[PDB]
Amino acid sequence: WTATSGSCKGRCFELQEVGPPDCRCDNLCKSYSSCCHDFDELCLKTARGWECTKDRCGEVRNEENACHCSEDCLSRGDCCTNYQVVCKGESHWVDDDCEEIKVPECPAGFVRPPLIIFSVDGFRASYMKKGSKVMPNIEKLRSCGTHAPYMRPVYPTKTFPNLYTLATGLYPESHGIVGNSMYDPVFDASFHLRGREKFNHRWWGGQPLWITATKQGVRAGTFFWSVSIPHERRILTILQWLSLPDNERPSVYAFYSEQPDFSGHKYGPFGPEMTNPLREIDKTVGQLMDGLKQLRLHRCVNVIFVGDHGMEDVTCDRTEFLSNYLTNVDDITLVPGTLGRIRAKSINNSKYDPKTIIAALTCKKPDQHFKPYMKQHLPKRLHYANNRRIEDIHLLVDRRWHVARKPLDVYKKCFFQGDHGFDNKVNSMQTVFVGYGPTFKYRTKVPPFENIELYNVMCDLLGLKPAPNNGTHGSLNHLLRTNTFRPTMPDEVSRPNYPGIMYLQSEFDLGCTCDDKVENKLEELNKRLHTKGSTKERHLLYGRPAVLYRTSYDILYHTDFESGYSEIFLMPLWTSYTISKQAEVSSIPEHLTNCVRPDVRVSPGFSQNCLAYKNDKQMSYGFLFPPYLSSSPEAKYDAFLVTNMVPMYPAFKRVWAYFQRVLVKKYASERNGVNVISGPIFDYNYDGLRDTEDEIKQYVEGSSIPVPTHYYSIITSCLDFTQPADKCDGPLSVSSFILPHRPDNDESCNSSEDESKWVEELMKMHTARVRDIEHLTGLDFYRKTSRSYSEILTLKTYLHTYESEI
Ligand SMILES: *[C@@H]1O[C@H](CO)[C@@H](O[C@@H]2O[C@H](CO)[C@@H](O[C@@H]3O[C@H](CO[C@H]4O[C@H](CO)[C@@H](O)[C@H](O[C@H]5O[C@H](CO)[C@@H](O)[C@H](O)[C@@H]5O[C@H]5O[C@H](CO)[C@@H](O)[C@H](O)[C@@H]5O)[C@@H]4O)[C@@H](O)[C@H](O[C@H]4O[C@H](CO)[C@@H](O)[C@H](O)[C@@H]4O[C@H]4O[C@H](CO)[C@@H](O)[C@H](O)[C@@H]4O)[C@@H]3O)[C@H](O)[C@H]2NC(C)=O)[C@H](O)[C@H]1NC(C)=O
Ligand SMILES: [Ca+2]
Ligand SMILES: [Ca+2]
Ligand SMILES: [Cl-]
Numbered sequence: 001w002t003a004t005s006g007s008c009k010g011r012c013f014e015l016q017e018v019g020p021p022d023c024r025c026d027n028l029c030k031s032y033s034s035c036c037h038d039f040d041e042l043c044l045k046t047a048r049g050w051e052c053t054k055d056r057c058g059e060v061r062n063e064e065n066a067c068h069c070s071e072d073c074l075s076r077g078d079c080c081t082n083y084q085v086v087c088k089g090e091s092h093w094v095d096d097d098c099e100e101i102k103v104p105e106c107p108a109g110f111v112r113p114p115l116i117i118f119s120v121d122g123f124r125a126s127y128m129k130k131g132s133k134v135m136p137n138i139e140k141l142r143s144c145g146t147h148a149p150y151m152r153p154v155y156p157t158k159t160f161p162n163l164y165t166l167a168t169g170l171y172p173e174s175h176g177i178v179g180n181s182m183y184d185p186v187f188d189a190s191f192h193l194r195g196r197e198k199f200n201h202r203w204w205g206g207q208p209l210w211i212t213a214t215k216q217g218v219r220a221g222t223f224f225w226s227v228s229i230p231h232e233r234r235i236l237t238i239l240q241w242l243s244l245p246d247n248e249r250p251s252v253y254a255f256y257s258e259q260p261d262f263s264g265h266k267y268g269p270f271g272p273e274m275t276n277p278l279r280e281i282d283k284t285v286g287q288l289m290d291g292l293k294q295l296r297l298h299r300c301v302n303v304i305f306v307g308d309h310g311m312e313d314v315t316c317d318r319t320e321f322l323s324n325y326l327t328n329v330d331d332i333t334l335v336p337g338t339l340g341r342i343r344a345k346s347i348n349n350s351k352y353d354p355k356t357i358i359a360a361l362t363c364k365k366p367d368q369h370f371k372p373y374m375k376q377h378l379p380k381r382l383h384y385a386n387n388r389r390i391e392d393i394h395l396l397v398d399r400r401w402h403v404a405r406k407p408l409d410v411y412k413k414c415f416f417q418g419d420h421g422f423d424n425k426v427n428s429m430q431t432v433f434v435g436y437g438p439t440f441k442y443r444t445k446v447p448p449f450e451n452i453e454l455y456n457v458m459c460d461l462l463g464l465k466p467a468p469n470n471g472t473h474g475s476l477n478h479l480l481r482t483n484t485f486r487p488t489m490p491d492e493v494s495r496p497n498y499p500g501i502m503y504l505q506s507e508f509d510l511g512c513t514c515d516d517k518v519e520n521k522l523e524e525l526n527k528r529l530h531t532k533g534s535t536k537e538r539h540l541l542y543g544r545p546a547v548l549y550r551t552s553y554d555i556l557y558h559t560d561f562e563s564g565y566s567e568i569f570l571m572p573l574w575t576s577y578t579i580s581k582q583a584e585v586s587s588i589p590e591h592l593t594n595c596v597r598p599d600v601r602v603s604p605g606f607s608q609n610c611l612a613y614k615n616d617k618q619m620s621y622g623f624l625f626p627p628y629l630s631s632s633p634e635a636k637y638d639a640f641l642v643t644n645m646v647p648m649y650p651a652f653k654r655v656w657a658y659f660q661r662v663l664v665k666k667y668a669s670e671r672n673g674v675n676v677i678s679g680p681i682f683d684y685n686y687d688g689l690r691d692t693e694d695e696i697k698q699y700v701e702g703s704s705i706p707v708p709t710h711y712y713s714i715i716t717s718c719l720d721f722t723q724p725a726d727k728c729d730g731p732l733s734v735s736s737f738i739l740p741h742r743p744d745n746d747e748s749c750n751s752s753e754d755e756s757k758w759v760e761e762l763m764k765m766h767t768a769r770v771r772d773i774e775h776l777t778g779l780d781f782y783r784k785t786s787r788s789y790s791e792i793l794t795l796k797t798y799l800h801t802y803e804s805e806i
């Protein structure tokens with residue numbers, strides 16, 4: 001119930017929202033069907049339209065008009081945005097040369113430069129270039145301020161998950177808005193685009209920017225707008241708020257546009273019908289900038305022009321139907337379209353089995369355009385599993401396709417030509433970022449970055465402390481002229497032991513054997529030097545990783561590699577080695593195929609044993625430093641040390657061996673040397689965070705050897721590839737992956753073929769940021785470089801995506 005008999009007189013677009021049953025006059029009252037009876041009349045005036053004309057100049061004020069052109073409109077803060085151009089001989093902002101904004105030029109009473117977020121739905125990254133001829137205002141923002149060639153959205157590349165991640169710095173799994181449709185089994189409640197459930201606060205987690213600002217005494221405009229409020233009224237409203245007295249005036253504002261998404265769905269990303277929506281959004285930007293220039297704020301305000309996701313060509317005929325795969329299609333509920341989420345139609349059906357559904361959906365047709373996953377097996381870079389609203393069964397749909405449950409769903413619901421929601425590394429899903437104003441850099445291009453990083457920067461722009469979030473604060477320092485955030489490196493929590501030779505061979509009873517008892521003061525001193533770390537500067541290029549949790553671990557040095565060996569997990573946390581461009585690949589010699597050697601620096605009690613692998617019929621083992629890349633035949637024996645061994649399913653060994661034997665050297669050849677850090681990851685609760693010892697769900701049979709859920713590698717070389725990775729003077733270049741450690745290769749439909757036809761494709765899908773590995777391991781990398789710490793933070797957030805040129 002709302003008492004709509006109240007009035008909006010003097011309350012139009014009020015900032016504090018009133019509780020029911022009192023009628024509302026704020027920018028969302030329409031969405032709640034709760035506006036006061038006179039809101040349209042008072043607050044949504046339209047008379048005479050949105051532009052001054054010569055004949056209106058100096059007119060007598062008529063309070064009926066949408067906007068004003070009377071002499072008093074500047075003091076009232078309500079002129080039409082083109083007032084000074086038409087009536088006072090001024091230029092449009094778009095026609096002025098740009099000139100660096102070295103310092104804020106703000107009117108008195110302004111405590112800080114205000115921040116205006118101008119968000120555009122569906123605005124694909126390539127519009128900035130492809131549409132530049134029809135977007136002169138946006139083009140001037142882009143060319144004069146700071147811009148990225150694209151910004152990566154979060155998965156799924158849907159609107160509410162991405163707008164809310166912009167607002168919170170959080171992954172969807174953490175903020176709770178995990179799709180445009182959701183079921184929460186704890187609430188037993190459904191969230192839909194249409195309807196009222198979606199307004200309930202329990203869906204929306206984290207702390208969005210307007211709340212962060214409000215708690216720290218920074219006033220905020222209200223961010224969201226009911227769809228029926230025309231864009232011109234939204235701009236006029238922001239400009240009017242900016243004319244409030246100092247103690248009443250917000251410092252942060254948001255505009256939202258439903259275009260170009262609305263037309264992009266109808267016409268496809270590049271339909272000829274798309275020129276007009278782009279023109280219209282550019283005109284809206286022009287209104288804002290002209291309005292700011294009228295208020296003398298155009299060199300005071302920081303403007304962010306930002307998109308939530310792009311838009312791909314998708315038509316009804318490219319739909320896969322689950323009815324063509326599943327016998328039991330009526331026992332499932334599917335959330336359909338550009339992603340699939342499956343759960344049981346009824347929780348009372350004890351014949352529902354996720355394994356049989358996954359198997360019926362796995363590589364069943366040659367050109368199959370989706371791939372099923374249990375959510376914990378999705379690429380860790382998607383960060384898309386740790387929420388009860390995300391169904392266990394996920395379908396990753398190929399770009400340009402849809403999945404649906406039955407054909408009748410698609411013609412009894414062709415209409416549309418565009419859609420979005422695909423994997424966030426897909427080039428069509430990329431979106432835009434431009435920052436313009438005194439706090440951003442002038443005429444500066446910055447590399448692509450993820451939208452999770454923006455909340456921290458918006459907080460820096462407003463002098464706010466960000467709530468805990470998934471950005472890496474400081475990684476976007478290079479966008480900013482001032483207000484940078486100068487993080488310190490985290491303190492190491494555990495210091496390593498450096499064991500020397502402490503055990504005799506006969507103390508070990510590991511069931512291992514090795515043909516290594518075939519035997520010199522020239523070489524003996526030298527092998528002792530290697531074990532004390534004489535080659536460590538070649539193999540550990542960026543300092544040792546720091547361990548940011550309490551554990552007991554040993555540093556182990558060798559000729560060709562260094563490792564941090566966990567006495568708790570019985571294996572390295574990390575192994576580091578450098579492979580120069582000139583390195584040679586060798587084989588594992590016949591006499592050494594089954595060799596595993598006790599490590600006389602590490603007690604039998606803190607070692608793996610070979611007998612556990614012999615008896616575990618599903619589990620085999622691999623090596624972190626690859627025997628294939630040993631520097632010499634003698635050095636190769638170190639690679640078969642029990643402290644270099646890790647548990648590996650035979651199917652996974654196919655992947656790993658190919659990586660080690662073929663790909664590492666390929667990357668060293670291409671990149672002029674690589675440094676590799678590799679290791680296990682344990683994330684049995686799929687939260688993105690390192691598991692403690694009591695969270696481990698699987699061990700090598702009969703032992704205390706934990707089985708990793710994933711294996712990572714971080715491959716670093718010199719950005720200037722004329723310099724070898726081990727003698728690099730400037731910026732670094734990185735790529736990394738987090739491979740799932742699975743007992744089959746059902747993910748790779750072509751896995752019966754030679755590894756050269758499928759392994760690298762698998763690795764690219766599982767591409768990762770260093771930061772993802774840090775969260776997953778409790779390690780902190782690149783601790784000793786010659787680079788600024790914010791530059792290293794940027795490097796740690798990098799994702800190598802393998803997509804062609806945008
Ligand atoms: C991305 O960044 C984010 C933000 O930093 C990271 O998320 C944080 O990670 C922490 C660890 O997972 C987590 O800390 C926990 O907080 C618990 C209290 O939580 C509430 O309070 C906070 C603060 O205001 C609030 O933000 C939370 O919001 C979550 O939950 C509500 C629903 O109530 C949602 O609306 C909201 O969207 C959000 O959901 C997300 O997180 C929760 C977990 O909190 C998930 O369940 C959801 O799936 C979703 O992803 C909460 O309202 C606190 O109680 C926890 O402490 C337990 O464990 C510690 C171990 O140290 C132990 O000392 C405690 O005793 C306690 O154990 C007891 O409870 C156990 C479980 O019931 C039980 O097993 C034990 O036996 C004990 O009884 C813990 O400290 C923090 O809350 C989230 N924050 C957010 C916003 O998500 C995220 O990790 C980053 N991601 C990556 C990849 O880096
Ligand atoms: Ca859309
Ligand atoms: Ca975990
Ligand atoms: Cl969805």
Ligand code: NA
Nearest residue numbers: 613616617619
């Ligand atoms: Na075995």
Ligand code: NA
Nearest residue numbers: 745746748751
């Ligand atoms: Na396969």
